[PDB]
Design a protein around this ligand. Structure first.
Ligand SMILES: [Cl-]
Ligand SMILES: [Cl-]
Ligand SMILES: [Cl-]
Ligand SMILES: [Cl-]
Ligand SMILES: [Cl-]
Ligand SMILES: [Cl-]
Ligand SMILES: [Cs+]
Ligand SMILES: [Cs+]
Ligand SMILES: [Cs+]
Ligand SMILES: [Cs+]
Ligand SMILES: [Cs+]
Ligand SMILES: [Cs+]
Ligand SMILES: [Cs+]
Ligand SMILES: [Cs+]
Ligand SMILES: [Cs+]
Ligand SMILES: [Cs+]
Ligand SMILES: [Cs+]
Ligand SMILES: [Cs+]
Ligand SMILES: [Cs+]
Ligand SMILES: [Cs+]
Lengths: 263, 263
């Protein structure tokens, strides 16, 4: 099978978008073959399907970095001018608010944090204050740190591996945040497969820093820079009375490759 | 800059070939950008330049798996029939003997082992018989093992990191070989950058198993299957009186992708 694809770099979290048309029944198999290290290789695969913008993720979840890649493809390939628009994305009940801004910055509305719980977590001989941020299908812990260290990283791995996690949470994020350096070291745990990954960058993790800032200061944040291993992402977040948290991320994306993949 | 490229899977040791013409002065920079994990990503990059077959490796060394990828490209894209021919490859004084065989098997002549030294290496509380195989620009140790284990893998890492290596050897290979299972677990150490990689597969390591078989049995081997993590490679090796070791590897290659890369 020939697959028409583009590979993109949104802060080091490598994304493929598929341009060619396939049955949704094949997305799982196509994506699994493409993301392999012995193939094109990537972290996430999206399929590009009047209501003309539709992105379907191979797992059918919402992905901010893949949506951001899709916005970039629309600007780059379809020559869209700067504007505010909506996209249909798998994993979302409502259309997602997107924007193309000047200087090729792309803004994506992120899933609403339902509630927050200030907590402390015990790792080793130390306790850390953390903010538990609860979404419909995942949970992030924002853990302020003086500096990220391999010792702390080992402690965090042990913590996620030793804990029992609600089956509500498809992913468990441990977001180590150096507040002074505005630096995020994101860890993603997938309970079902008991696998951990220290991400180059994390759209959803960046969004969680915006909610953390809102809780911590009662201040909105606008274009707050979250530095990460793979680059940086901006977060805009405000609590809007009864409407709750309204959070978006903004970033740049580079196309690294386009052509045909063989599966 | 637009780079026209193909990505190939020769037993899991991912290779890119560049089709577009560039100044040799740029190969280093182009290859470094393409092989990055935040780009197309691969292990090795070759540039395809009457004496019409010329392959230039980004580091200017000879690569069996990249030559094997180039042979596959010639069969697939230029529709070459089964035949014996020669290719000019960087890192080689003489043209390299290549063949396209039936069922898309590709054979590549490998660098001549200059001499062998039966040795024992001490790792931990154990000694292992090994064959030191000396080439012009690298050395491989073939170490027969009952079974490959993480313990043995840690011991081998410690061994290469603790040793002093002649600057003659651009690479140091530790080739753990399960003789009964014909299974190779190849470790490549680069002294200059003090970096180790447990390869999915190793063309040069496969060639070393052929020399080991020749030394061990005084028998030629023909289409001897070397199983490796990424798949398998065949080795044909014989000692030819004063002409010394004559060794080739044979394998299949899959094209995974072709198109344009942006650097
Ligand atoms: Cl179907
Ligand atoms: Cl939980
Ligand atoms: Cl696991
Ligand atoms: Cl030049
Ligand atoms: Cl040495
Ligand atoms: Cl190192
Ligand atoms: Cs269909
Ligand atoms: Cs992957
Ligand atoms: Cs667990
Ligand atoms: Cs828990
Ligand atoms: Cs998520
Ligand atoms: Cs700001
Ligand atoms: Cs800023
Ligand atoms: Cs030139
Ligand atoms: Cs690489
Ligand atoms: Cs060393
Ligand atoms: Cs040595
Ligand atoms: Cs080599
Ligand atoms: Cs054989
Ligand atoms: Cs065989």
């Amino acid at each position: 099978q020939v697959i028409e694809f583009s590979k993109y770099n949104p802060s080091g979290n490598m994304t493929i978008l598929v341009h060619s048309k396939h049955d949704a029944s094949e997305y799982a198999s196509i994506a699994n073959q493409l993301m392999a290290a012995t193939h094109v290789c990537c972290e996430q695969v999206g399929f590009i399907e009047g209501n003309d913008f539709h992105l379907v993720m191979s797992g059918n979840e919402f992905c901010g970095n893949a949506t951001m890649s899709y916005i970039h493809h629309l600007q780059e390939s379809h020559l869209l001018k700067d504007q505010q628009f909506k996209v249909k994305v798998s994993g979302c009940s409502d259309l997602v608010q997107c924007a193309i801004h000047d200087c090729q910055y792309y803004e994506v509305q992120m899933p609403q944090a339902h509630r927050v719980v200030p907590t402390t977590i015990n790792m080793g001989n130390h306790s850390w204050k953390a903010l538990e941020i609860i979404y419909e299908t995942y949970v992030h812990y924002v853990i302020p740190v003086k500096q990220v260290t391999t010792e702390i990283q080992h402690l965090v791995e042990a913590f996620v591996r030793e804990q029992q996690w609600s089956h509500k949470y498809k992913t468990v994020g441990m977001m180590l945040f150096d507040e002074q350096r505005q630096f995020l070291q994101p860890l993603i745990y997938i309970p079902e497969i008991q696998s951990l990954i220290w991400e180059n960058s994390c759209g959803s993790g960046t969004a969680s820093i915006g909610v953390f800032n809102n809780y911590q200061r009662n201040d909105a944040c606008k274009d707050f820079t979250v530095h990460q291993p793979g680059g940086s992402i901006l977060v805009t977040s405000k609590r809007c009375h009864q409407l709750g948290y309204q959070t978006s991320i903004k970033g740049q994306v580079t196309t690294v490759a386009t052509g045909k993949a063989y599966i």
